[PDB]
Amino acid sequence: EIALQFAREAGLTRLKGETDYVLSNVLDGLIGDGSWRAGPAYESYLNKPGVDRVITTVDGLHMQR
Amino acid sequence: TALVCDNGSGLVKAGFAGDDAPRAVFPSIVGRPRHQGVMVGMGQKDSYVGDEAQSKRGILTLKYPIEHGIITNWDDMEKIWHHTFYNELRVAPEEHPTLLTEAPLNPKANREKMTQIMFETFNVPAMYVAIQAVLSLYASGRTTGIVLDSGDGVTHNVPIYEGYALPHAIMRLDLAGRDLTDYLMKILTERGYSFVTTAEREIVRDIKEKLCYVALDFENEMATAASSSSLEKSYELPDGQVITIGNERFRCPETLFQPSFIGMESAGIHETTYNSIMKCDIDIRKDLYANNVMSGGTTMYPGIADRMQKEITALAPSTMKIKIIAPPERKYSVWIGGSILASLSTFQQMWITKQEYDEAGPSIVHRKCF
Amino acid sequence: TALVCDNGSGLVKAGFAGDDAPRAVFPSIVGRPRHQGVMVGMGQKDSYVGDEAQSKRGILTLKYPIEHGIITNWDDMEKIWHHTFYNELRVAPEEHPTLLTEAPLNPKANREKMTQIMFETFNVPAMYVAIQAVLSLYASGRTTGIVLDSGDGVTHNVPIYEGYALPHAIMRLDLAGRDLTDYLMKILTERGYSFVTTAEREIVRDIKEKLCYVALDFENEMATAASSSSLEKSYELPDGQVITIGNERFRCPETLFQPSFIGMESAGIHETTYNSIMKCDIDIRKDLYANNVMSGGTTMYPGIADRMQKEITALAPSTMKIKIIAPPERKYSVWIGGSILASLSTFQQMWITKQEYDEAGPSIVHRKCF
Amino acid sequence: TALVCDNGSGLVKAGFAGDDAPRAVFPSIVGRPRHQGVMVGMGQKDSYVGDEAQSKRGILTLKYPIEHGIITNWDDMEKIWHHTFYNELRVAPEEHPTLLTEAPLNPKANREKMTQIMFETFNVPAMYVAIQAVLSLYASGRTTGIVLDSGDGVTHNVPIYEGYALPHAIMRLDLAGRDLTDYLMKILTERGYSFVTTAEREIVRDIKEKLCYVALDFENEMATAASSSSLEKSYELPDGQVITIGNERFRCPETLFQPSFIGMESAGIHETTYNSIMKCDIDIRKDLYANNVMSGGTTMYPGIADRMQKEITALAPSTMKIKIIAPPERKYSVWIGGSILASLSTFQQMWITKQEYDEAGPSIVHRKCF
Amino acid sequence: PFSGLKFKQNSFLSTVPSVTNMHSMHFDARETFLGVIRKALEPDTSTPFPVRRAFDGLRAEILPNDTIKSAALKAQCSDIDKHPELKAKMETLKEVITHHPQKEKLA
Ligand SMILES: Nc1ncnc2c1ncn2[C@@H]1O[C@H](COP(=O)(O)OP(=O)(O)O)[C@@H](O)[C@H]1O
Ligand SMILES: Nc1ncnc2c1ncn2[C@@H]1O[C@H](COP(=O)(O)OP(=O)(O)O)[C@@H](O)[C@H]1O
Ligand SMILES: Nc1ncnc2c1ncn2[C@@H]1O[C@H](COP(=O)(O)OP(=O)(O)O)[C@@H](O)[C@H]1O
Ligand SMILES: [Mg+2]
Ligand SMILES: [Mg+2]
Ligand SMILES: [Mg+2]
């Protein structure tokens, strides 16, 4: 759980399967399935299904177009 | 009949001792008009309290008189108390002893001024200030257990064994619901939803209450939200605009277990409860582990009880049986306990009476109340 | 009794507080002879005011002392006010406190001068200057809503909620009936009709009031007018000549929603109303959407409310309930509200008195009046 | 070498890393003709960017593709960037790493779109998105201090200590120069001056930039202006009209310290800086108090630094030494820091490269940059 | 006497009668022309308020709207030798007129 927080927040697993030998095996020890070699699943904020164009109270004070 | 008023940082739970639930529950807010004029006929009251403030929030600045368990505006607090007695419970305080509550490790002046105001401006025949964790244990029907009480203002742990508190093992954490509301505001801007005003803080609090949940495995939920839209839920704002919220649903409550999310150098509620237990005598730890009692609104997130079990189990020795007690009415458990306490015949001598207040002054509250 | 004088750009609506309608409604015009001589005894009267100027229109040059809700000719405005007091109401102004009106966001000298004249020229015991949108909301009975006021000089909307105005949300467009009158005589030249004098402008105003309407969908109405003669209406000029107008009937009012017709960059009244609402707190928007109240002559076009209903519904989120309130007494709502306001017992202390004026001068108006 | 493009809400500051000042500074505006026709063979275009849009402002509608720090028109942003690279810097973006900037607490889609367009449209070999306040500290040459950056779109505070930011203490107010320009437009109507078009908004911006100043004592200045004309200055409009402006000179920028002027329920910039410091660890507050560094055009008001010194000194304990750092070049300090940052050899491995992008996609920006 | 006094240019052009009406057999040339000059002497709002009030008293006294007042002033000035105050007021106003920025059009 700590190791995956490092991958999530610090890019510990940036190099994917190119991770150096000792780190990879330590990760293999903690994560036996090897799925960590596929980096963390990062979300993308582009083209999100339903997030577009909301106008709050302060936003309503500028309102171009 | 005694009056039981649980003045939390967020909500005023008030009612009568012996009842199954508080008669009046309303926000602990005083609102004042921040806009101009302009019509004469409407009367234009200068200040609003509670539900009236909440409904008119569009044109008010909302102020909480209690910050992290501490009364910070005594004028507004007296407004909230006058509203509780005369407008909500419709009682004459001169006729009822009043049981108040407050979190442990509060400033001592806070206790004294509550006593002074109740006896001097409300002329209660008697009063009492209780500890919310102790009242929650009363409401659980137990005499042993460590209560994790988390409301709007502060989270605190009180370990109790056979009715005896271990005050050296009490843990207090000013990370509570309001800080989670503020954090959600911060991360809601990541999707373009910028809430700023106090009225909009109330909307964000509403979003938190019915969309946020605690993740059992934070990394797993993060991966799920990244790779799918199955965790995304929508919320309609008062003006009809719809916001869609994804991993912010479980990232907001996650702050309770990773206070470094909001820049707080403290351990999460799981490790604080475990640290409280370990500060207790080795011979009572087994019973505390099996009697973790959740209390307060901030413990109402879906999945928080199961997360606390996983977390406390990961810290404790494997042979310990960890049990998290999360009753459905844990939001009112504190008021429920006060209702039980004030009803007991054996408690009827514990009241601070007006005579004792007169001889001793407000300092009597320290001598006669934990 | 208090006099109410709604001194609009186009019309003077004056009367006594407490009455349901103004007593004197006459054009806000001063006409002066522009022709010669030539008979003894028939020219001693220079300048004509109001209805008499409109009847002698054919030999006069007509001038409005108010343009865009702003008094531009104070000598003629004194004549208009002297006519109102002495000839139309038949009152001594020094015996009656006078409530008068103005548009929001006017120049501040406009209020100061009209206070100066009322106290120093007409010797009024007391006076007050109210905002026309606020008076319209008074007339509607409501205390919440966004009024769209559009008369002859200016169109403004004032959002009010529980009697509180949000001044940062006030909108002004210097686009009102007179601009629409001018546009109509511009597009009347397309059919070979030439109206150039001030008298002819008055008759074109008459044509606008009788034949112009707002098309629910402008493009379909243009297609209909282009494909058939069903929308043509005839009008008889004062000399017996008959003019017929087709799509000019709805192209003139369309300028309200498409100000680019007259070269203005401003947004239409529908979009201006929506922008005003969105400038308000997210909490009050739902009530504002349901309480769009129209007032003024320029909102008397047939189909204006339906068009506004449609246009605002297209801009707002689909879950909001848009309601346009267009009382049949729209044209006098402002005067009606002022009649209500001046007769309320709670308003009698808000008058600017002659004594306060003496002590403070004309600037007292900025302190006592919105 | 690397390109540095500090595209804020109001202006584009662009140039090469290592230079002392941006090479290309032009308004962040796209203008389109709002009038008709009419001459063939004229060098007419369907849109104009930057300085050319300002020149032909008279017959155009001017649109800002960025408002309150957020890119709201990505089509117009791409031609702003095409204008920057090809017409203003005369460079091929395909062979220059480009450093971009944005305000803190922006929507995350904003950075991702910026990254996507730079790699996919302009095919830059590498790029980086930095935080404007951090760049301002780079330009000041400090590694400690709380930056108040105020441009046209947003004002934000970023406290930094020994190069460590405290992101929980970052403040952001969507109240900056553009809001002040609109407020000056509003209060100019009090003197009869009307400005409603976008072109006239540019004129009012010019009036604000050279006549408005911050009052040390607002009530004293109000009394001075009310009693005398020593504070009234004149300004000649493009058509030769001369407007005289009195207390509006300091009322416009007073909105920074009293946001309620424009209906914002918010603390002034002085309180926001103090609030930001208090959210920081008690052990670093002293060094933050002495290192308040201003940046951005909206901090170029005369007397603003003195007003901040007075206001923060009144909020902090008397023993602390408040110091406001306002370099004369604080308008370009953000671009200067970007030029410094992009020229460091220690920075060259922090760029997001093209290979990084096409292996990860736009979201890479959130991992690589702040 | 009056410093900082400004006028709205062209404010008086609307006030000029048509030439044909000037030929009317009952045209009041003195009152109509004095009305034009009165309109031209209207202080611009940009004039400081103390000056506006100060001058408006001067032109209101010398160029009143009311015909009764205008006829009253006309008589009092017939024996102006006994009205040194009017002499001073009229001299002050003549000095204002001669410095009026649009004197040429007024002439
Ligand atoms: N169902 C819920 N889910 C998540 N949070 C909740 C829920 N109900 C209440 N809360 C939070 O709990 C807080 C109020 O809890 P409460 O026990 O009333 O605290 P207090 O004793 O300070 O009034 C609020 O800040 C609210 O955000
Ligand atoms: N029935 C009508 N249809 C369309 N326009 C009208 C109608 N009646 C009046 N108007 C317009 O309204 C204007 C007068 O409205 P009013 O509210 O009196 O304005 P004000 O308050 O400035 O006098 C006129 O310019 C006229 O063209
Ligand atoms: N000398 C000045 N005095 C007051 N305001 C100024 C001055 N110069 C620029 N400004 C304001 O600063 C803003 C531009 O600042 P800038 O830092 O370029 O913002 P951005 O980073 O969004 O381009 C403009 O809105 C302008 O009104
Ligand atoms: Mg509680
Ligand atoms: Mg009207
Ligand atoms: Mg900037």
- DSSP states along D12-60: EEEEETT-SS-SEEEE--EEEE-S----TTS---S-EETHHHHHTGGGE
Q: What angle do the packed helices C333-343 and C132-139 form, to 10 degrees?
A: 80
The C-alpha atoms of residue B249 and residue B233 are separated, in whole angstroms, by: 8
Q: In what order do the strands lie in the sheet with D48-49?
A: D48-49, D30-33, D60-63
Domains and CATH numbers, chain C: 1-26+68-133+333-366 (3.30.420.40), 27-67 (2.30.36.70), 134-180+270-332 (3.30.420.40), 181-269 (3.90.640.10)
Is the peptide bond between A26 and the residue preceding it cis, with omega within 30 degrees of 0?
A: no
Count other Cβ atoms within 10 Å, centred on residue B198.
Answer: 17
Q: Which of B61, B191, B194 to probe by mutation at the D interface, max D CB count within 10 Å? A: B194
Residue D175's φ and ψ, nearest 5 degrees, are -145, 105
The C-alpha atoms of residue C244 and residue C247 are separated, in whole angstroms, by: 10
Residue B188's φ and ψ, nearest 5 degrees, are -70, -25
Nearest CA to D245 out of D301, D162, D314, D189 is that of: D189
Q: Which residues contact D252 (CB under 8 A, 6 or more apart)?
A: D180, D183, D184, D187, D208, D212
Beta strands C164-165 and C155-161 are antiparallel
Contact with chain D for residue E3, Cβ under 8 A = no
What ligand 3 atom has the least distance to the C-alpha of D180?
27
Residue C232's region, left for phi above 0, alpha for psi from -120 to 50, else beta, is beta
The subunits that touch chain E, with at least 3 C-beta pairs less than 8 Å apart, are C, D
Q: In this structure, which amino acid lies at residue D259?
A: P
Count other Cβ atoms within 10 Å, centred on residue B297.
Answer: 19
Q: What is the DSSP letter of C65?
A: S
DSSP bridge partners of B275: none
Q: Which residues contact D148 (CB under 8 A, 6 or more apart)?
A: D155, D156, D157, D269, D273, D292, D293, D294, D295, D299, D308
List the alpha helices (DSSP H) in chain D.
Answer: 51-55, 74-82, 108-120, 132-140, 177-188, 198-211, 218-227, 248-257, 269-278, 285-289, 304-315, 333-343, 354-360, 364-368
- The answer to whether the CB of D48 falls within 8 A of the CB of D56 is yes
Q: CB under 6 Å to ligand 3: residues?
A: D 8-11, 151-153, 177-178, 181, 205, 208-209, 296-298, 300-301, 331
In this complex, do E4 and D191 lie within 8 Å of one another by their Cβ atoms? Answer: no
Residue D80's region, left for phi above 0, alpha for psi from -120 to 50, else beta, is alpha
Determine the longest span between alpha carbons in chain C, in angstroms: 72
Nearest CA to B358 out of B49, B62, B120, B64 is that of: B120
- The answer to whether the CB of B337 falls within 8 A of the CB of B134 is yes
Contact with chain C for residue B57, Cβ under 8 A = yes
Is the peptide bond between D38 and the residue preceding it cis, with omega within 30 degrees of 0?
A: yes
In this complex, do B242 and C318 lie within 8 Å of one another by their Cβ atoms? Answer: no
C-alpha C107: how far from chain center = 17
DSSP bridge partners of D150: D155
Structure tokens at B293: 């009692």
Nearest CA to B325 out of B344, B353, B304, B347 is that of: B304
Neighbouring C-alpha atoms within 13 Å toward the C-beta of D326: 18
In this complex, do C265 and D192 lie within 8 Å of one another by their Cβ atoms? Answer: no
The C-alpha atoms of residue C47 and residue C36 are separated, in whole angstroms, by: 14
Task: Count interface pairs A-D at CB distance under 8 A.
Answer: 42
- Among the bound ligands, name the one nearest to the CA of residue D175: 3
The C-alpha atoms of residue D338 and residue D369 are separated, in whole angstroms, by: 14
Residue E32's φ and ψ, nearest 5 degrees, are -70, -45
Residues of B within 8 A of A51 (CB-CB) are 191-192, 243-244
**B97 alpha carbon – ligand 1 mean position (Å):** 27
In this complex, do C168 and D198 lie within 8 Å of one another by their Cβ atoms? Answer: no
The C-alpha atoms of residue B61 and residue C246 are separated, in whole angstroms, by: 54
Residue C180's φ and ψ, nearest 5 degrees, are -70, -40
Structure tokens at B235: 């919320």
In this complex, do C370 and B39 lie within 8 Å of one another by their Cβ atoms? Answer: no
Nearest CA to B289 out of B314, B264, B266 is that of: B314
3-state helix, strand, coil in chain E (%, to 5): 65, 0, 35
- SS3 of residue D70 by DSSP: strand
Nearest CA to A51 out of B194, B222, C274, C280 is that of: B194
Whole-number CA gyration radius for chain E:
15
Neighbouring C-alpha atoms within 13 Å toward the C-beta of D339: 18
DSSP class per residue in C160-189: EETTEE-GGG-EEES-SHHHHHHHHHHHGG
**Which of B195, B218, B234 lies nearest to residue A50, judging by beta carbons?**
B234
In this complex, do C278 and A56 lie within 8 Å of one another by their Cβ atoms? Answer: no
- The answer to whether the CB of D71 falls within 8 A of the CB of D33 is no
The C-alpha atoms of residue D238 and residue D216 are separated, in whole angstroms, by: 31
Nearest CA to D58 out of C265, A63, C255 is that of: C265
Structure tokens at C9: 């750009």
What's the residue count for chain C?
Answer: 370
**C112 alpha carbon – ligand 4 mean position (Å):** 56
Q: Which residue has tokens 């934990």? A: B370
Alpha-carbon distance values, C196 to C185, C200, C253 (Å): 8, 6, 20
Q: Which residues contact D122 (CB under 8 A, 6 or more apart)?
A: D81, D82, D85, D93, D94, D98
Q: Which of B29, B52, B59, B193 to probe by mutation at the C interface, max C CB count within 10 Å? A: B59
Is the peptide bond between C38 and the residue preceding it cis, with omega within 30 degrees of 0?
A: yes
The C-alpha atoms of residue C190 and residue D260 are separated, in whole angstroms, by: 50
Residue D156's region, left for phi above 0, alpha for psi from -120 to 50, else beta, is beta
Structure tokens at A37: 């070699």
- SS3 of residue B62 by DSSP: strand
The C-alpha atoms of residue E29 and residue E33 are separated, in whole angstroms, by: 6
List the alpha helices (DSSP H) in chain C.
Answer: 51-55, 74-82, 108-120, 132-139, 177-187, 198-211, 218-227, 248-254, 269-278, 285-289, 304-315, 333-343, 354-360, 364-368
Alpha-carbon distance values, B294 to B133, B137, B146, B327 (Å): 9, 9, 9, 8
Count other Cβ atoms within 10 Å, centred on residue E32.
Answer: 16
Give the resolution in Å.
Answer: 2.6
Task: Count interface pairs B-D at CB distance under 8 A.
Answer: 30
Nearest CA to A56 out of C167, B241, C286 is that of: B241
Nearest CA to E23 out of E15, E35, E14, E32 is that of: E32
- The answer to whether the CB of C212 falls within 8 A of the CB of C205 is no
